């Protein structure tokens, strides 16, 4: 068996690499804002420490989409139960219980594999495919690493008077400032387009919900940004919850693929997950400090709106006076 032999070889190489690293050891952020490469190094160093909850959520949505069976419905229900307590302090106590439940249910799931119509018994797991378990295993890996990092907290780093160090992206004195403004100000106006496309490419009747959501935000996003973080996070939680409701409901209705006219046309038995990715990213952006300065910029523009009108009237009167002068000169010429 070449597969088992390669597995044993990799297991040996796991300790071989550790021994080699130990021998090489025995023998032989504040700089974040300076340059793009430094920020990239910061992401390399603490990608998980900042984005673990979002990454675990997206892996969970990945497994929901990949399986679409009855067992992953527990995944979805516990996902939603995690979301309803979105604030990380409740996740602080829920996460050990989350990991315990994940391992408990995965044990039963793996046991059931080896050991009542054919379509329904395939849709469920009763006497049973098991190739799909790779995504669930990856979910457990990511959640376990999140638990480890969260417990460690990397307490030595953790990488409103004036806490924002260099908030002034708006003036863009560096390439990093250009990218930071293009992420912090011109991305909500891409989350809206992602929502629209997600609604309008999957023709099911949930996409019409996305079209309503896009049409609503697009008429009130420019004033949504003006709000403080409270209402922003409330409404954004509402939209995230609607999106996760859509994905879990699609998982449920996947049952209608086993017991298989107008209803199936009307409910149409990825695009509804990229929207989830962008929604989580933007919800992380909102609460962040580096968004306070751009919100202040929007407030300044809102208050400065009035001056532009007088400036434009001045320009119009200057042009009108100029053209009256030139007409007078021409008519004097003719006379």
């Amino acid at each position: 068996i070449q597969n088992h032999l390669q597995i044993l070889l990799l297991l040996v190489f796991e300790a071989v690499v550790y021994r080699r690293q130990e021998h090489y050891r025995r023998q032989h952020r504040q700089r974040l804002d300076q340059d793009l490469l430094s920020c990239l190094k910061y992401f390399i160093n603490f990608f998980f420490y900042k984005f673990g909850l979002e990454i675990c959520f997206l892996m969970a949505v990945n497994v929901i989409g990949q399986r679409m069976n009855f067992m992953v419905i527990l995944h979805g229900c516990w996902l939603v139960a995690i979301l309803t307590r979105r604030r990380r302090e409740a996740i602080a106590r829920l996460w050990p219980n989350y990991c315990l439940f994940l391992t408990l249910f995965l044990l039963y799931q793996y046991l059931l594999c080896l050991g009542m119509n054919s379509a329904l018994i395939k849709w469920l797991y009763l006497p049973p495919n098991s190739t799909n378990l790779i995504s669930d295993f990856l979910l457990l890996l990511c959640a376990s690493q999140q638990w480890q990092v969260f417990s460690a907290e990397r307490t030595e780093e953790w990488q409103r008077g004036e806490p924002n160090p260099i908030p002034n992206f708006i003036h863009c004195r560096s390439y990093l400032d250009m990218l930071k403004v293009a992420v912090f100000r011109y991305l909500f106006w891409l989350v809206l387009v992602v929502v629209f496309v997600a609604g309008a490419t999957r023709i099911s009747i949930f996409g019409l919900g996305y079209l309503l959501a896009c049409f609503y935000l697009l008429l009130f996003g420019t004033t949504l940004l003006q709000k403080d973080t409270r209402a922003q996070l409330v409404l954004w939680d509402c939209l995230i919850l609607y999106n996760v409701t859509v994905i879990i409901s699609k998982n449920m209705l996947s049952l209608l693929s086993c017991v298989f006219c107008w209803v199936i046309q009307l409910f149409s038995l990825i695009w509804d997950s990229i929207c989830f990715f962008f929604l989580l990213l933007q919800r992380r952006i909102f609460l962040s400090h580096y968004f306070l300065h751009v919100s202040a910029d929007l407030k300044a523009t809102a208050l400065q709106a009035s001056r532009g009108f007088a400036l434009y009237n001045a320009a119009n009167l200057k042009s009108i006076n100029f053209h009256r002068q030139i007409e007078e000169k021409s008519l004097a010429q003719l006379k």
């Binding site: 088992h4 044993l8 297991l11 090489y24 391992t103 044990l107 793996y110 098991s130 190739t131 790779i134």
Partner: protein, 83 residues
Amino acid sequence: LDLAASFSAVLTRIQVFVRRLLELHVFKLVALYTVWVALKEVSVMNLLLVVLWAFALPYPRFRPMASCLSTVWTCIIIVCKML
């Protein structure tokens, strides 16, 4: 000229980066191949090996124990090949 020195410096940096990345990631990356094998062919022999890594990932306290027991669990490969 300076090309050889630049190549040597690049090689040293690559070695340092590889060592750091290994020390940071291998502890979790080890179980990936075992999980892939277990999903490839579900069997009683591979079930214990999968479960050991599954429990080890949640609790890092048993992770060194799982690393030690990986060789013991891999002994079934020879028996399977003989059968």
